[PDB]
């Protein structure tokens, strides 16, 4: 039936020659039954002692009988690489709604698909005889490197047809499962499902009958899927007074997963508990704010919320909010407030940044995510005004582009906290910094610093200058580094020094910063 | 078919496919399906683990989609094959032509086919993806123009003698046609060429001509002010000092004296006699490129771009730091669209001048460039590129 895929061993290498380890007589018995069986079903075939290849076999015990488990580690190491099977799974928000849905288990998949004839000789294995004084495979063996790939590749061609005569039916293959969904009415649907099973059968492929099948709703990769809505499986937040680093990590973990749908989840406080921890089993007492967070998450988590599916007929709308310094939340909907999916972006790119960059970046992250799930970019609703954005844009040396977006008056609004003058200020004192400074007005200060780093000393200077200067002030620095950082007009930083500066900068009426060699 | 092979030891590209929009995917499916029916390409099995990213791009003023395959990786690993008319740049007008379609008439070495595998991706992973491999010389592959040269030479034989007044250069899927005729008598010669090629080709770059004698270079330029404040001078010294690297004849000793002591930034300073002459001399030294900078073919061409603002950009093509071979400006869209136009423009130039693409250094976040570059790209080649963060000082010393 189904065409054979040419297989070959890696360049220069040769089939495996691994001696079969000792097998008890009871197992030796179990195998000869299993194998003799598989020789009858064409899956394997006795060969002549010309085949110097061999792969060790061993029997494993939920009845009294055993099952053959062939160890292909060697062959696999010697077999060519293949086009890897899909690594990623469709995210629910990318599905459309459906009336009926059926999952079909495809038993002994690899067992029904031919193996390249020229390759079989390499799958040789031996079954020792108890009498004190060999086969090869003719199909895809379990545990072999190239089976998950060729099996999929097959089923696809196998499905191609039934797929063209039923463009209304939707099929998705995942390992040995076949999820089929449609908008047929119950009856017709199940009937089509029935045709599918025949078609799969005509190629020796066998599946479960309606009674033993799996039907909505059903878990799947930590989700809980219905034909009309979706969500996450029941997350239980433990109740106790003694938390270990592990628990906290696991919880934080569980908390994150949940935010792709539960808006408002917060972990900042939980995650501060891990600071300086010495051992996975160390017990960290919950602080007041952590307890307040936990409890708030519990609340949010008690009353479930589902997401609706993607309706390709309508637009994707994305809205973003600033939920704290360095924290952003977003939701993508089509019908007003009817979420397909939500999420939060906390990623800081670089040691210093401002809300305009972060926002923009979150936008890029959201855009990318959307192209992957829906294959289009959403129209954004941003808490930033066109002019504010544009002002930061042109003043920045890097280039960027935000797709279709419209200001949404939803405080807090993102803005720039200060703007360096474009030219030196008349009548504003001039400070020359090098740790100290000298002004034109004669004043000066010199301070000593223990525990520092050349470049931190540089920021220190500037700092002093800002402190002792009036509401307007010109500052001349030699440090191109300090210049660089302040030029980018950061409003948030990893360093406290930069953060103090920024504070100062926000208080001034006019600051001019220049550099000289 | 000619038995092409990879550089010794090297294997085939296994390049990750950047995700696409339902819009491009559709186009690529229509296009490929047509290419399949004509045996240009073929579906492939899981026994082929290679991969080259593919993209769909819009043909300028044509409404039709173009399949753009990024064989950069394959090309680097494709064996070298064993010339550039320094005259082409001298011509007054040059029209670029897309002779890519010629390749489709030449079968590709059967054992090389697997390396041209590429994939049409899917939305949200709903399905593994269409996999294909080329049966003919693929557009964009270093190997095509080579394996087709001979045939391309023969086919250009007539026009070449019937019009030895126009130079014809070939680079990848493009034909660079230079001449000095009049823009009308020129477009006609290009068309006769087109009709000729049809005998055995869309215009690129607006169907328009580049005009390559004006490719102007750009000096460093010092401010020309009435009154000079402490700030101005400081900035002036800074810039000069930088340029001091390239042009050693630059002096600042006299300017720096105007900046002795700690004066206020806005204090207007009268330039002494000594100083005034030092400036003007610095000014003269800057009016022309530093002498002794020669193109070395055995070295890479690097292009570095800076964003100036207001839709203005600056770039520099060199091989060794400071040793600039060319410098220019580009002005308006949106940041990305511009940068992609600039890139395509600077590339074209490099191709016309030195017969090769330069490595770019782009001032943009990778994820962002990867997202919209294909929205405005129109060339058929793809330069190599890395992403960077330009310092406020470098930009502060150009344009
Ligand atoms: C458990 C989810 O299974 C699937 C995953 C990926 N694709 C399919 C087929 C297409 N299904 C679509 S577009 N919709 C859809 C709607 C609801 C449910 C419960 C399953 N699928 C699936 F049925």
From Swiss-Prot, chain A:
Positions that bind Mg(2+) 2: 434, 458, 478
Effect of residue 98 to N: Confers resistance to atevirdine, efavirenz, emivirine and nevirapine
Recorded coiled-coil stretches: none
Impact reported for residue 181 to T: Confers resistance to efavirenz, HBY 097 and nevirapine
Phenotypic consequence of residue 175 to T: Confers resistance to abacavir, didanosine, emtricitabine, lamivudine and zalcitabine
Top-level division of the source organism's lineage: Viruses
Domain RNase H type-1: 425-517
UniProt-recorded name of the protein: Reverse transcriptase/ribonuclease H
Parent-protein residues present: 591 to 1124 of 1435
Swiss-Prot record, chain B:
Top-level taxon of the source organism: Viruses
Variant or mutagenesis effect after changing residue 376 to L: No effect on RT p66/p51 heterodimerization
Organism classification: Viruses, Riboviria, Pararnavirae, Artverviricota, Revtraviricetes
Effect of residue 172 to L: 90% loss of polymerase activity. No loss of RNase H activity
Reported impact of residue 373 to L: No effect on RT p66/p51 heterodimerization
Outcome (variant: residue 141 to F): 10% loss of DNA-directed DNA polymerase activity. 22% loss of RNA-directed DNA polymerase activity
Result when mutating residue 144 to G: Complete loss of polymerase activity. No loss of RNase H activity
Reported impact of residue 174 to N: Loss of pyrophosphorolysis (reverse of the polymerase reaction). No effect on RNase H activity
Resulting phenotype, residue 175 to I: 29% loss of DNA-directed DNA polymerase activity. 46% loss of RNA-directed DNA polymerase activity
Protein name (Swiss-Prot/TrEMBL): p51 RT
Residues with site note (Essential for RT p66/p51 heterodimerization): 372, 385
Effect recorded for residue 207 to A: Complete loss of RNA-dependent DNA polymerase activity. Complete loss of RNA 5'-end and 3'-end cleavages
Location of the region described as RT 'primer grip' in the Swiss-Prot/TrEMBL record: 203-211
Organism: Human immunodeficiency virus type 1 group M subtype B (isolate BH10)
Effect upon mutating residue 145 to G: 34% loss of polymerase activity. No loss of RNase H activity
Span covered, complete protein: 606 to 1027 of 1447
């Amino acid at each position: 039936p189904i065409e054979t895929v040419p297989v070959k061993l890696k360049p220069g290498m040769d089939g495996p020659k691994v001696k079969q380890w000792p097998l008890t007589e009871e197992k030796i018995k179990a195998l000869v039954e299993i194998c003799t069986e598989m020789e009858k079903e064409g899956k394997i075939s006795k060969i002549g002692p010309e085949n110097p290849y061999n792969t060790p076999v061993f029997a494993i015990k939920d009845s009294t009988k055993w099952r053959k488990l062939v160890d292909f580690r060697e062959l696999n190491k010697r077999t060519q690489d293949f086009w890897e099977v899909q690594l990623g799974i469709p995210h629910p928000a990318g599905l459309k709604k459906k009336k009926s849905v059926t999952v079909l288990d495809v038993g002994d998949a690899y067992f029904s698909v031919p193996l390249d004839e020229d390759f079989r000789k390499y799958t040789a294995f031996t079954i020792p005889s108890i009498n004190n004084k060999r086969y090869q495979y003719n199909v895809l063996p379990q545990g072999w490197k190239g089976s998950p790939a060729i099996f999929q590749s097959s089923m696809t061609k196998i499905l191609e047809p039934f797929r063209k005569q039923n463009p209304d039916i939707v099929i998705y293959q995942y390992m040995d499962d076949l999820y089929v969904g449609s908008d047929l009415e119950i009856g017709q649907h199940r009937t089509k499902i029935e045709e599918l099973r025949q078609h799969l059968l005509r190629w020796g492929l066998t599946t479960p009958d309606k009674k033993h099948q799996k039907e909505p709703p059903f878990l799947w990769m930590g989700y809980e899927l219905h034909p009309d809505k979706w969500t996450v499986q029941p997350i239980v937040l433990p109740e106790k007074d003694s938390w270990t680093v592990n628990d906290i990590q696991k919880l934080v973990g569980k908390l994150n997963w949940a935010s792709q749908i539960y808006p408002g989840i917060k972990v900042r406080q939980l995650c501060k508990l891990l600071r300086g921890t010495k051992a996975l089993t160390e017990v960290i007492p919950l602080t007041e704010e952590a307890e307040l967070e936990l409890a708030e998450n519990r609340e949010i988590l008690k009353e479930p919320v589902h997401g609706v599916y993607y309706d390709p007929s309508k637009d994707l709308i994305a809205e973003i909010q600033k939920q704290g310094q360095g924290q952003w939340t977003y939701q993508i909907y089509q019908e007003p407030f009817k979420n397909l999916k939500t999420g939060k972006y906390a990623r800081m790119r670089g040691a210093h940044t401002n809300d305009v960059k972060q926002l923009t970046e979150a936008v890029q992250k959201i855009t990318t995510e959307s192209i992957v799930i829906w294959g289009k970019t959403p129209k954004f609703k941003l808490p930033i005004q066109k002019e504010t954005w544009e002002t930061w844009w042109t003043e920045y040396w890097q280039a960027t582009w935000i797709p279709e977006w419209e200001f949404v008056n939803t405080p807090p609004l993102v803005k720039l906290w200060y703007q360096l003058e474009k030219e030196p200020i008349v009548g504003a004192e001039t400070f020359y910094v090098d740790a100290g400074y000298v002004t034109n007005r004669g004043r000066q200060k010199v301070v000593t610093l223990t525990d520092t780093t050349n470049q931190k000393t540089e920021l220190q200077a500037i700092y002093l200058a800002l402190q002792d200067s009036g509401l307007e002030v010109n500052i001349v620095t030699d440090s191109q580094y300090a210049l660089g950082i302040i030029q980018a007009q950061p409003d948030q930083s990893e360093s406290e020094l930069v953060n103090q500066i920024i504070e100062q900068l926000i208080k001034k009426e006019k600051v001019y910063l220049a550099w000289v060699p | 078919t000619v038995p092409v092979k990879l550089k010794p030891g090297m294997d085939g590209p296994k390049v990750k496919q950047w995700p696409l929009t339902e819009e491009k995917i559709k186009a690529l499916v229509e296009i490929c399906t047509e290419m399949e029916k004509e045996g240009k390409i073929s579906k492939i099995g899981p026994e082929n683990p290679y991969n080259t990213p593919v993209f769909a791009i819009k043909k300028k003023d044509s409404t039709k989609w173009r399949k753009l395959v990024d064989f950069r990786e394959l090309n680097k690993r494709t064996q070298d094959f064993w010339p550039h008319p320094a005259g082409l740049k001298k011509k007054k007008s040059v029209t670029v032509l897309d002779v890519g379609d010629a390749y489709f008439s030449v079968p590709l070495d059967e054992d090389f086919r697997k390396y041209t595998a590429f994939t049409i991706p899917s939305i949200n992973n709903k399905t593994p993806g269409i996999r294909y491999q080329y049966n003919v010389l693929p557009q964009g592959w270093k190997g095509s123009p080579a394996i087709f040269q001979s045939s391309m030479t023969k086919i250009l034989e007539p026009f070449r003698k019937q019009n030895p007044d126009i130079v014809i250069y070939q680079y990848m899927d493009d034909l660079y046609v230079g001449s000095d005729l009049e823009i009308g008598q020129h477009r006609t010669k290009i068309e006769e060429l087109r009709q000729h090629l049809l005998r055995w080709p869309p215009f690129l770059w607006m169907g328009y001509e580049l005009h390559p004698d004006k490719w102007t270079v750009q000096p460093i330029v010092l401010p020309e002010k009435d009154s000079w404040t402490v700030n101005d001078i400081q900035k002036l010294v800074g810039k000069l000092n930088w340029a001091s690297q390239i042009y050693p004849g630059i002096k600042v000793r006299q300017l720096c004296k105007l900046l002795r002591g700690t004066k206020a930034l806005t204090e207007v300073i009268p330039l002494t006699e000594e100083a005034e002459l030092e400036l003007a001399e610095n000014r003269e030294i800057l009016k022309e490129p530093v002498h002794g900078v020669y193109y070395d073919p055995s070295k890479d061409l690097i292009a570095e771009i800076q964003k100036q603002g207001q839709g203005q950009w600056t770039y520099q093509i060199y091989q060794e730091p400071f040793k600039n071979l060319k410098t220019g400006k580009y002005a308006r869209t949106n940041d990305v669209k511009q940068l992609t136009e600039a890139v395509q423009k600077i590339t074209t130039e490099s191709i016309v001048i030195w017969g090769k693409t330069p490595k770019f250094k782009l001032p943009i976040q990778k994820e962002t460039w990867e997202t919209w570059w294909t929205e405005y790209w129109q060339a058929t080649w793809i330069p190599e590129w890395e992403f960077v963060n330009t310092p406020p000082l470098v930009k502060l010393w150009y344009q």
